[PDB]
Symmetry: D2
Subunit: 115 residues, 4 copies
């Protein structure tokens, strides 16, 4: 799995299920080009975003719609979204897991990068 995103809910102590996100890749004109998207599963995970051949060097942005997630729970959150912007594959293919831990006024994110 070249790119996987895992989302956790720090308020309820659960996977964050049905969280929508889009992935973009920076174009030569510095605009954000659509690249991938999906919703987290019942495990809070989004697999199958891309393939090794398609996922080449670039700057990528994962934009996670945390606002809709909290609004569905009756909570007015701080952020419009959680976004994770990173260069990928600059030294050739790697596997990336992006994790995001969500609270109404805070988020934490980390990456696990494996060869």
């Amino acid at each position: 799995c070249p790119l996987m995103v895992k989302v956790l809910d720090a308020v309820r102590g659960s996977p964050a299920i049905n969280v929508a996100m889009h992935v973009f890749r920076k174009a030569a004109d510095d605009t954000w080009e659509p690249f991938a998207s999906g919703k987290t599963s019942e495990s809070g995970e989004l697999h199958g975003l891309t393939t090794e051949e398609e996922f080449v060097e670039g700057i990528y942005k994962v934009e996670i719609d945390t606002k809709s997630y909290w609004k569905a729970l009756g909570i007015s959150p701080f952020h419009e979204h959680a976004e994770v912007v990173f260069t990928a594959n600059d030294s050739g293919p790697r596997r990336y897991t992006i994790a995001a831990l969500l609270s109404p006024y805070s988020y934490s994110t980390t990456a696990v990068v494996t060869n």
Copy 2:
């Protein structure tokens, strides 16, 4: 001072000093308009970005140049920047403190919103 940003370094146990950041505000055409910028002080704080009169309702993005910070310490970090996107002042004027805690492959961010 209706908007303050504080940045901390989780590797060295220190304020993150001389960290650059840019603040944008979403324009009516959905583009990001430059709003303010600056660098953190020896306390890791950036004060004086805006004024009560200038800091109107809107969607704001704070883009913290974490990459240059880590590269100056000899570390190749994961993220291009740490970004915080939020709606401000939609129920009237508030004071915002945005805090960010930085590691090479991770960041955590929270907001303190006061009336």
Copy 3:
């Protein structure tokens, strides 16, 4: 798996491998009684700490030896250990995943609790 611990390294962007930890359970005299222990695998995970029948209501403490982990990497960390203290199984059995994200001067921890 009634109790699993997952440990991540925010400096290197990797699972935290070979991280030792002990689990204790609070006794009636408020002392900490040994309960379980182990080291994280190459995935940063420690499975098989306990069984459903043995893991009953109590206050549990997971004490993760983060100091030895950082010292092995030539880093002088802040904490002696990362500890996670929680009541478990007070409403009958649950499955617990405890995650810890480690930096030299900081740690973040969350729990996923499932029925």
Copy 4:
């Protein structure tokens, strides 16, 4: 003020006010001796715990009563407390700021250590 603790609430986007905490110091017999205690102010800060003369080399534990804080808001949280265990002043006197960011099922903590 060689030791200060600041506590933030990630659910409400506010300082965590009136949060109790106890500080212990490890005695020669490996027991935890009471060292200081207090409650956070309206800014989420607890100042004046100790003095330069009293704050000697040692292993210290800060135990933050996060459980009572969440219970007072109607939330049944995961942790009994958030705790921070660290060696202080072993290379000479330092000033320590311990920060903790709280959610019902998660906490993040960092230290700022200055000379």
